[PDB]
Amino acid sequence: IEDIKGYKPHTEEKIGKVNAIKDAEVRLGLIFDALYDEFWEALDNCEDCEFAKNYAESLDQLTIAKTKLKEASMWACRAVFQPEEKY
Amino acid sequence: MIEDIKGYKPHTEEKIGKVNAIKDAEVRLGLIFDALYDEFWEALDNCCEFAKNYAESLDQLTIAKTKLKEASMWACRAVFQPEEKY
Amino acid sequence: IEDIKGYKPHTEEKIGKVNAIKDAEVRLGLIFDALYDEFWEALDNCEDCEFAKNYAESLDQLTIAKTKLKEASMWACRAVFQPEEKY
Amino acid sequence: SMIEDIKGYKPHTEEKIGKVNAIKDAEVRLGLIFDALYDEFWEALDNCEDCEFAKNYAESLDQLTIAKTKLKEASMWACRAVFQPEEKY
Amino acid sequence: MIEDIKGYKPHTEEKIGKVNAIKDAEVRLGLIFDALYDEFWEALDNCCEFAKNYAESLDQLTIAKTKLKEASMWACRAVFQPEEKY
Amino acid sequence: IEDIKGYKPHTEEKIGKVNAIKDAEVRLGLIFDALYDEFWEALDNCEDCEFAKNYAESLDQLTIAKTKLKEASMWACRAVFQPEEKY
Ligand SMILES: Nc1nc2c(ncn2[C@@H]2O[C@@H]3COP(=O)(O)O[C@H]4[C@@H](O)[C@H](n5cnc6c(N)ncnc65)O[C@@H]4COP(=O)(O)O[C@H]3[C@H]2O)c(=O)[nH]1
Ligand SMILES: Nc1nc2c(ncn2[C@@H]2O[C@@H]3COP(=O)(O)O[C@H]4[C@@H](O)[C@H](n5cnc6c(N)ncnc65)O[C@@H]4COP(=O)(O)O[C@H]3[C@H]2O)c(=O)[nH]1
Ligand SMILES: Nc1nc2c(ncn2[C@@H]2O[C@@H]3COP(=O)(O)O[C@H]4[C@@H](O)[C@H](n5cnc6c(N)ncnc65)O[C@@H]4COP(=O)(O)O[C@H]3[C@H]2O)c(=O)[nH]1
Ligand SMILES: [Ca+2]
Ligand SMILES: [Ca+2]
Ligand SMILES: [Ca+2]
Ligand SMILES: [Ca+2]
């Protein structure tokens, strides 16, 4: 960790909390992933059907959801690790 | 009964189950955020050398909760599939 | 609505406010959509031209704008609906 | 003032001006709806104080503040798309 | 002219200097993002084992670039101080 | 690093790149911080003045700016570190 600027040492309490966040994060993210795959297969069956547009939009929205979830976990983990804030 | 909300389409049992599964997992993570928040706040309240760090962590958990709610809203929207005019 | 966890019944007042917010959101959204179609048509004509990358960048930025707008509306609608906030 | 003084800025055109101002016109329209709802919740909270719905009103105010921020970001990105500044990265 | 844009206000020498200071520093970081992106891209283009990893980092650097431009826009907005109707 | 779920070991190339990102981030963040302090003092001199509202708004905007910058950095750093991505 010392090689990385602003990083501080781990502690047992921090490791547990960070892994608890990540575990719950992954649980939700895998739900997003399963829904994504479902939408993908449905879109793949007929790209010119009425619902194709709707399926494509749902894929984009689930990609947004995954991005937001990773940001939420990174902010939460940052709060726990309590890194040196220069600004 | 006719749909009262602009762009809303009807529910289906499959959509309800999926949306409630998203929200269930969302709240589970959100309650972890809430617990860490209360812990930090309590520390701050009883604080010392780390007061600044505690307040920054509180601000960052507030952001985390906001991002999580946005994650859930986008995913439930994707399942609901309301009319997307743009 | 009661089938969705955290949801509350609709009221005439909430329906009017929510609809008003969406109405305005769609208006702006349609402006974004028209500008998007313009750049798309420009790319159709331009192809390999000097401004192709600029049109593609504006397309990406309008996609971002659309995303932002939807998030604004969602947050506003949430404020009006007032669901149970568990965290 | 001169846009040329700002790094990456390019000259305006009638077309861009019209489009940019159309975005901002529609943006402010929605923002004023947010502001009206915000003021309504603010007054309700002023009146409510210790009442049971106080937490709901305060959360609604926080969420409308987020909504306003997102709308300005949406406008900014759309306007940037029309202006088409130099994009170094 | 700035007056043609709704809500815009006149520049000042101080504002110009601060806005360009933000944009300058923004670009330095952005170019670092761009260099890393091109490196990942060349790696993918000429490749294998970590293809998925390279593609993922390209997506994450695209996000990073977007966040940076938003950071700059907000900072620049703060300096310019346009009319804020809401 | 191996105690944190999803983390992979560091390498010298990674360390250098991540710290280069962080250095450039802080440089911009300190500019944001300097502007924030300037606006704060201006607001503190006359909180009932006509421009107090504008200064206050500028402070909120800078705060948002700082938050975006840290997110930019975290995403870039994540890209370089290349942790295990389960979803
Ligand atoms: N004080 C302190 N803070 C830390 C430490 N490790 C991370 N942090 C902070 O938490 C942020 C989020 O970590 P994350 O696990 O949720 O996302 C991390 C993680 O996904 C990835 N990352 C960090 N170290 C990694 C590593 N060894 N291996 C693989 N991936 C790694 O890059 C993300 C962003 O790193 P960052 O430095 O820019 O922001 C950290 C950083 O500010 C740490 O050891 N000490
Ligand atoms: N086709 C369809 N789409 C729906 C329906 N209900 C919601 N949606 C969509 O999913 C979005 C996210 O829902 P959320 O539950 O994750 O966050 C919702 C939810 O938290 C809250 N909300 C909506 N209806 C509510 C209600 N009755 N009661 C309490 N809160 C409510 O407001 C949020 C945003 O509403 P929104 O309309 O702008 O976007 C919806 C909306 O576009 C629906 O019934 N049918
Ligand atoms: N080629 C080009 N691109 C422009 C020009 N003006 C703006 N842009 C781009 O559009 C972005 C968003 O514009 P906005 O009106 O929606 O937000 C603006 C606006 O709210 C404020 N701003 C810009 N010029 C201003 C000005 N004279 N006076 C008051 N406020 C001003 O700051 C934001 C712009 O910050 P930015 O420079 O980082 O991003 C611009 C910038 O990238 C321009 O004249 N030429
Ligand atoms: Ca009162
Ligand atoms: Ca009063
Ligand atoms: Ca009283
Ligand atoms: Ca000054």
DSSP string for A22-51: HHHHHHHHHHHHHHHHHHHHHHHH-TTSTT
For residue F36, tell me if it sits in a domain: yes
Tell me if E78 sits within 8 A of F55, measured CB to CB: no
Index of the ligand 3 atom closest to the CA of residue E77: 32
Residue F49 DSSP code:
S
Domain boundaries, position B43? 31-79
Smallest Cβ distance to C33: which of B6, B33, B86? B86
Tell me if B43 sits within 8 A of B54, measured CB to CB: yes
Any ligand 1 atom below 6 A from CB of A53: no
Q: Which residue of A has its CA nearest to B25?
A: A28
d(CA D33, CA D26): 11
d(CA F1, CA F8): 7
Is the CB of A80 less than 8 angstroms away from the CB of B67? no
d(CA E30, CA E65): 6
Question: What is the three-state SS of chain E?
Answer: CHHHCCCCCCCCHHHHHHHHHHHHHHHHHHHHHHHHHHHHHHHHHCCCCCHHHHHHHHHHHHHHHHHHHHHHHHHHHHHHCCCCCC
Any chains having at least 3 CB pairs less than 8 A from chain F are A, E
The residue whose CA is least distant from atom 18 of ligand 2 is C78
Q: Report residue D57 as tokens.
A: 């009103």
Any ligand 2 atom below 6 A from CB of B80: yes
d(CA C17, CA D34): 10
Ligand nearest to the CA of D47: 4
Please, how many CA atoms are within 13 Å of residue A37, restricted to the half-sphere of its CB? 7
Closest approach of B67 to chain C, Cα-based (Å): 11
Q: Report residue F12 as tokens.
A: 């010298």
Experimental approach? X-ray
> Which one-letter amino acid corresponds to residue D62?
D
d(CA D57, CA C68): 24
Number of helices (H), then strands (E), belonging to chain B: the values are 2, 0
d(CA D71, CA D56): 22
**First CA to last CA across chain C, in angstroms?**
21
Give chain B positions within 8 Å (CB) of A76: 32-33, 36, 60-61, 64
For residue F1, tell me if it sits in a domain: no
For residue B67, tell me if it sits in a domain: yes
The answer to the question of whether B9 is labelled as a binding residue is yes
Neighbours of F23 (CB within 10 A): 13
Smallest Cβ distance to B23: which of C6, C32, C33? C6
Ligand 1, from A3, A8, A74, A85: best to mutate by most atoms within 8 Å of Cβ? A74
Closest among A57, A27, A29, A59 to A41, alpha carbons compared: A59
For residue C46, tell me if it sits in a domain: yes
Compute the C-alpha angle A87/B47/A77, nearest 5°: 50
- Which of E18, E38, E53, E68 to mutate to probe the F interface, most F CBs <10 Å? E68
Residue D37 DSSP code:
H
d(CA D31, CA D18): 20
Any ligand 2 atom below 6 A from CB of B16: no
Q: Which residue of D has its CA nearest to C62?
A: D78
For residue E4, tell me if it sits in a domain: no
d(CA B71, CA C55): 30
| Burial group, residue B23, by CB count within 10 angstroms (0-12, 13-18, 19+) | buried
For residue C85, tell me if it sits in a domain: no
Any ligand 2 atom below 6 A from CB of B46: no
Closest among D17, E63, B15, A11 to A1, alpha carbons compared: A11
Compute the C-alpha angle E31/E34/E37, nearest 5°: 155
Q: Do chains E and B touch (3 or more CB pairs under 8 A)?
A: no
CA B16, B19, B23, B24 dihedral sign is positive
Is the CB of E85 less than 8 angstroms away from the CB of D7? no
DSSP H helical ranges for D1-89: 14-48, 54-83
For residue E37, tell me if it sits in a domain: yes
* Number of domains forming the structure of chain C: 1
Residue written as token pair 């970081």:
E29
Tell me the structure's resolution in angstroms, rounded to a single decimal: 2.0
For residue F5, tell me if it sits in a domain: no
Is the CB of B27 less than 8 angstroms away from the CB of C87? yes
Is the CB of D28 less than 8 angstroms away from the CB of E65? no
Q: Report residue C37 as tokens.
A: 């179609």
Sequence-distant (6+) residues with CB within 8 A of D69 are F64
Q: Residues 8..67 of D with a Cβ closer than 8 Å to C: which?
A: 19, 22-23, 26-27, 29-30, 33-34, 37, 41, 56, 59-61, 63-64, 66-67
Tell me if E7 sits within 8 A of E82, measured CB to CB: yes
Residue written as token pair 């870039």:
F76
Compute the C-alpha angle A33/A39/A40, nearest 5°: 85
Q: Report residue F19 as tokens.
A: 């710290």
Give chain C positions within 8 Å (CB) of B33: 87
- Total CB pairs under 8 A between chain D and E: 57
